[model samples]
Target: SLFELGKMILQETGKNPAKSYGAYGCNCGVLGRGGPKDATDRCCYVHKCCYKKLTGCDPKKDRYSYSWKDKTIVCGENNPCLKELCECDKAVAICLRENLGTYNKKYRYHLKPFCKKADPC
Candidate 1:
């Protein structure tokens, strides 16, 4: 049933089944609940919640970062900065607490920057 499952995944994500194997990912509000192998629906679904609650930006689009003005963080569509300089502290804290998991278990080095701080971003 691998072929059938692959077809279903393609239908859901509109990606080639071959590439769909790694097509979807979610930052879980940057709490580290993500990876290439995560279930497509699971990734997008959890991420949508964060996208809406945090930036309220394009819930249809997956954004990777946010912006800042001095100490105030901004979550517009087009902007970028160090996570500590951006305005996602509340989002990150809430997400981490809600989605408890191994921050260093799998993607340790890749997730180091986001895991370094926990307040006042």
Candidate 2:
């Protein structure tokens, strides 16, 4: 279990999450919504799958709709579930900012380039 936590922590601080197996394309991370969207949204897609494939986090329960801010899960080793959740979010946050030019202001609150309080978890 510690190995999973360690891998998740490393992912949290890293710039990218692994996306090699699943059918992760751009969408709201929602089912059947026609994913003709931006890279920002694609980051969300990757995030959903990131949790599904790599961590112990559950996408439906851990976070809210479309917003990367998840407070229900804590970000420490005491609980690996949320620790995994936080790492996925941090990865997506970095991804969102990296592809920020797609949507600059509409939902820019999700863009936390400096991690300035996006998801304190």
Candidate 3:
């Protein structure tokens, strides 16, 4: 839940889609691949683990990710659950900004091989 929220928040500032390769989101997509391609991917990787054990943050009915709301919501409602979720999302948001330069798509390698012919294979 919070994981999705984190990605949405990043989009406003701006991510990846669903999985298939593995479970960890080090690169933010479900390549279910592992390892952080850069600093930004690492943010989602860490954030993914945070929501794994969320308590008060309702994931069953109140899915923030699929909500009908329009504006970005604020985290934390003066409680432990939200606090934990808040911090994790906050950290990732900051991380994205910090590593914006290194941002790349899920399939970065195939997305633009022509642009960087000199890039390492």
Candidate 4:
């Protein structure tokens, strides 16, 4: 099974996770959600509700939202800041409130930015 899975991965990405593919990665590469072994400590998923609410990038024009102007502290396909922490080119819901275990317990929001001001929501 492991060999089959490895073959599938190689066929799709043309790269091997177990092999030393060299130091090459993009903002869209796989990120650790959980701790080294934990499953939920990695990246956040873009919920449908988020896309409906925010109108940031166009799906056709900005396939990955890697443009410089797209770095305005919002959602997009290729996250502006922490790729592992945010989902770029798309809107997302803060699913943490629902108690869904899709992420680590430390996950506060799907794409929440650091807010210094104590303003009301």
Candidate 5:
């Protein structure tokens, strides 16, 4: 879809892709991983039109990683993060308790503050 392609283009241009994952970088976007074994294989979009459905914003080439830079995702905003791409990674514990495993992927590479929560990982 137009949204997916736009997102891909944004990620390709915004993110360096070669940079190493920082302490927090382990959780960002669909490719987020924490452990040493973390790799591209662990990344996958929960839905087909994740780029569009999750964020109405069009894909921009200025994508970034959370650990490497400082970004913010809309918290409590009407444009909250999508399931897999939700910024509230730690907050996701509540969702998990409810068995909302569909939203497991990290998101908003540029936005880190929104993802960091006191909730259990």
Candidate 6:
């Protein structure tokens, strides 16, 4: 009887224990949505951090000059009969569209180039 009891205790103590899922199985260390396997895989970082991670350069230091004030407008307070609106520079217009959305909300403000000149015109 003593021999049988000793054998049963040794078998119970030799069993391998299972590991916890949160310890090593979870993929929370990648720092992105859906653990790098998702189709989009968009970064969870903030605006400046995302830009820095993608471009490896600072936006504040790389500013370009353009005709922001001197650009001629087709329609404004000076003209009311004109159908077409302000004539914005192609580059700056494209930049605004890409960087900021056309709509105004809590996240990003609206930059209406056309309405800028047509507001009074």
* Candidate 6 residue-wise lDDT, 1-121, digit = tens: 1122122223322311111101111111122112221111111112112233323322323222222244321223333111111111222223223333231222111122211121110
lDDT of 6: 0.22
Judging by lDDT, tell me the better candidate of 3 and 6.
3
Which candidate should be chosen as best, given TM-score against the real structure?
3
- How well does each candidate superpose onto the true structure, as a TM-score? 0.22, 0.42, 0.51, 0.20, 0.22, 0.17
Candidate 1 stretches with Cα past 4 Å from truth are 1-47, 50-57, 60-67, 76-90, 93-102, 107-121
Candidate with maximal lDDT: 3
- Candidate 3 residue lDDT tens string, 18-55: 33112322345343324555566566666566556778
lDDT of 5 by residue, 1-121 (tens): 2233233323333433223112213343343333211222123211112343544443333222222123322223233443224333212222222322332234223343433332122
**For candidate 5, which ten residues in a row score worst on lDDT?**
39-48
TM-score of 1: 0.22
Cα lDDT, all candidates: 0.34, 0.44, 0.48, 0.27, 0.29, 0.22
Report residue 67 deviation for candidate 3 (angstroms): 18
Mind giving the per-residue lDDT tens digits that candidate 2 earns over 1-121? 3233324323443322233211223333234222324576567666656666545555445542222235222345545666666667656656655664554333333322322222211
Model 3 bad stretches (over 4 Å):
1-12, 15-26, 30-33, 56-74, 106-121
Task: Tell me the lDDT of candidate 2.
Answer: 0.44
Clashing pairs in 3: 19-30, 21-31, 21-32, 22-32
Cα error, candidate 2, residue 53 (Å): 2.9
Question: Could you give candidate 1's per-residue lDDT for residues 1-121 as a string of tens digits?
Answer: 2333333334433445344232223332234443332333243334334333443333223333443356333444343332222233333333333333422224322332333322221
lDDT of 5 at 10: 37
Clashes (backbone N, CA, C under 3 Å), per candidate, total 1, 0, 4, 10, 6, 0
Pairs with backbone N, CA or C atoms under 3 Å apart (clashes), candidate 1: 73-87
Q: How well does candidate 2 match the true structure, expressed as C-alpha RMSD?
A: 13.7
- Ranked candidates (lDDT, high to low): 3, 2, 1, 5, 4, 6
Q: Give the Å error, residue 86, model 1.
A: 11
